Design a protein around this ligand. Sequence first.
Ligand code: ZN
Ligand code: ZN
Ligand code: ZN
Ligand code: ZN
Lengths: 554, 553
Amino acid sequence: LPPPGPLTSGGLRVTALGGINEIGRNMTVFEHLGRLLIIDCGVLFPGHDEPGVDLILPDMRHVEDRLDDIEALVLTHGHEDHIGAIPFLLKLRPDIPVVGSKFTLALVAEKCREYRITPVFVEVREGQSTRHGVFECEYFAVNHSTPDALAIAVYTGAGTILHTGDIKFDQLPPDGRPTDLPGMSRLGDTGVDLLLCDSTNAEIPGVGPSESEVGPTLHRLIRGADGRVIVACFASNVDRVQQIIDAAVALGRRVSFVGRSMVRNMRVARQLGFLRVADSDLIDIAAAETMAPDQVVLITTGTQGEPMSALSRMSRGEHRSITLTAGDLIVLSSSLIPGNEEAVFGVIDALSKIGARVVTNAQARVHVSGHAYAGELLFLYNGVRPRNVMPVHGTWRMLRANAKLAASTGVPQESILLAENGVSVDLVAGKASISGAVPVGKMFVDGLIAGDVGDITLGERLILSSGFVAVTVVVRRGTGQPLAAPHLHSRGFSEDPKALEPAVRKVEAELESLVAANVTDPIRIAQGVRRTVGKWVGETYRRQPMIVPTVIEV
Amino acid sequence: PPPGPLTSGGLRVTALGGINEIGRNMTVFEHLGRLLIIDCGVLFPGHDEPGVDLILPDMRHVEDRLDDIEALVLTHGHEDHIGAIPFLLKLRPDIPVVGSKFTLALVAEKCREYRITPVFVEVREGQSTRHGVFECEYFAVNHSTPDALAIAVYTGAGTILHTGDIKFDQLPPDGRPTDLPGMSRLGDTGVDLLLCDSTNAEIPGVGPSESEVGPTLHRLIRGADGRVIVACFASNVDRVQQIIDAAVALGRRVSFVGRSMVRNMRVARQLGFLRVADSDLIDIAAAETMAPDQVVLITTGTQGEPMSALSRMSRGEHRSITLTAGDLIVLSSSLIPGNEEAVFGVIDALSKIGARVVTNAQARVHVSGHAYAGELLFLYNGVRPRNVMPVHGTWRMLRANAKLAASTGVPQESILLAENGVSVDLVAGKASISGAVPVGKMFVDGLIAGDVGDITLGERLILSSGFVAVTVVVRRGTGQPLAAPHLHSRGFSEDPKALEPAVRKVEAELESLVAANVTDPIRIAQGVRRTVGKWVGETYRRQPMIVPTVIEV
RNA sequence: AAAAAAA
RNA sequence: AAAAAA
Ligand SMILES: [Zn+2]
Ligand SMILES: [Zn+2]
Ligand SMILES: [Zn+2]
Ligand SMILES: [Zn+2]
């Protein structure tokens, strides 16, 4: 629980600033002799408890004042959950060298155009090693949801470190590039002192299915459908876009992208040769309303029914470009991320009134996870035989699972280190051990101005769900004398006009026990009025809107 | 298109809630002027209904013809079927509410909460009652909570069967299956309309038996080395029974924890629906007293509702209990869509503690309480209704349940997808949709009704990003300002000098309207808002509410 | 697919 | 197990 000692010269301190008690805002910090290497730098996403904010970030208040001690930032892949906070760490220090694959940095480039940022790009590949001051980094292909992921090895005077990333052990991925358990196992034979292991699906047993399976079940599904077909998947997942495109043209339709993420992500994936699609099969969103329904497949956006994603708008007709018939077939080619049920289950239900057949994961095999199930994780622990393990990229139920997996491999119980954000692992003399914790908290991004939206701002943003009633009196500067009748507004409270009318009376009465008591102070007459209006809505409604007084002096 | 006069002698069914969604179930049958209402419950608030506490059916169609209501009849005691009973009997204390022994003992406590006593009629299976122009026979249905019944309403227009909340488990622990024979004899006499459960009509096959949960628990407690904690809905006496059976079979004893549980289990016992030797019950004082391997705690909070009992011990803010990592907690429940975040939250908190958490995804510790599509097929074959109308479900669930009934022989014309407030007219044998009427969500915020609505809610949604108030004092009639603007914010920023740039921006626009010699307070407050509203957009790109106020003096 | 009920 | 974007 107390902050760690100074790091024994010659050891590694590894500490996570996000992603070890959640799923998102991944950022882990390695220090060796005062120098710092960072792996990943992604975002979270705000829930119910974080009501006004755009994005949550890792708590970079320790790198905060150490910016010249970081040698480079290394990137497993290009998820938002691993590169979202980049344009915010680099604003602080625009010349961090950011290392990552050919596709990862391409997405890091476009997200850094939104901020007037050109970064220090060092593009790597698998089997490559680059050098970074004290640190030496070796890269390994990881097949996964999005192209070109890499696992990362970190060589240092404390020993060898393996970091896996969003990793999945599919022996038949459609791109031809399986995760590289061969290589990682060779590195195991040398010695791996600590293994930073993704634990997303350590709970799920067995071995998950191959992305290769999803392709047949669309080829069949597009076959059997008489009318137009539209398919919504994620946008990082271009293996599956290619699968849909294959199945599409194969049967004679023509593909058509719909949505800003989709249109732009496929653009880059073709420019880099990750997609491959003749222009004869690509048409624009216009022609979908042109050509007979049976001759077009729409690849759209918003598998979480986020309220203005392409497919969410289409389920309301409010997507002026195209409106959905009942001969349409929507196939939710994705997973239902926890916390987005009301959105997506509402959207399917909205689609059901319209009368269009919808196929989701529960009915078919249209989606396959992006992470190793607990039995593909059993391969890694056996091929790498790590000397200590530190579960990562998941919540506590997922890290606890993964610990048991690793222990069940023979990794001793001491060498398992459940290291929640801000708690640090120290690797000196080849032993790994928990050093100490530091407070790690959430940094919000509400629009354009930083630092100013806090636990207070949010607390009252949750208050305001019951609305507010406002009182407003004016006064002659020194007197208590009101100069005008009080003025009660309210928003988010009731929609009866007369709702506040018993309250304008009770204030008027209060407002003159004030006058008949020579309360000259604006603040005190603001308080007493505020209390009369609280205690009224209290007794009368037992609702608790925020009661906001305002006392102007003239 | 509204519905015309029910040509005399016919029967008109209209759902006033329960058919667009899952919840607030209330179905209204009209026959010759008089009305029968089947069920009356609540939909729990969601993420598009911010401050409300309970969504009720739109009884705005029936608040006038209250004295035409012959009786309110109850399939079982789910809050999705008896929640809004006091919000109905406050309008008419003397409505006769008809239900089974258990089903009525819950309307008891629910309405006690509200200073109400209702006029009861306690019925059982295979037994008729008459209610004015309606006669009602009751058939036992097997379901998650005890003593549910399906309902048949014979009237001069034909004969209707209402399933309620049906499931066809063939080995219920209580030992009293759903009365599918009965329903098939009633089928041989010919039913003209079936109101069929639609909840799980999308899942193929025949769901599992409550009889399977028993063993899984008996294993889990036998294998556990410390204390055990099981969470299930307080309605499910049968589940709480095989939890209890298991514990005492293993020299353990039991302690309940939670308003719902402790209440509903004492009642279950008083009415002999749960049988437990006083010898085998202890209290939470004696719970933490004894050895862990002696106890089994039966708790609330399977949905991780924030103030629940488990969700308290997950956070260590519980008096008389604290969860060690030697504990085994069992979420003997499902995960209603919409409470993932909440349940996982509690599962994670429990994980950081170190105690094993067996959910329904790693063992057979829960079974659904609504028939799967293969079970429903035993019903369309057993009843053979001439017309089918699906109920108790969402829209993807209705299209499913409608498809089942076509595949089973009912003509497409005879399968009637009648939404909330949409009417269906059985007029001498034939069934058809006779139009619709607007129907909505009666919200219950605090102590009033009809008070909150669409635009109130839409405001509470905007206020997730705060408001900014700009306040102008003016000399009456002139439009001439008398102080400088007074900006405030509240859920916008903690930068105390955040609005300062904007006072100088609204002064210039007050100074721009005085030259306009525009003196209207409405219009000046329009201008003092669009200014400060597009300074927040420009400078901050945040989108709070803008509340102008212009007090003239 | 029904809630829950103030450390 | 990641977003959506006129
Ligand atoms: Zn990730
Ligand atoms: Zn990933
Ligand atoms: Zn129900
Ligand atoms: Zn039920």
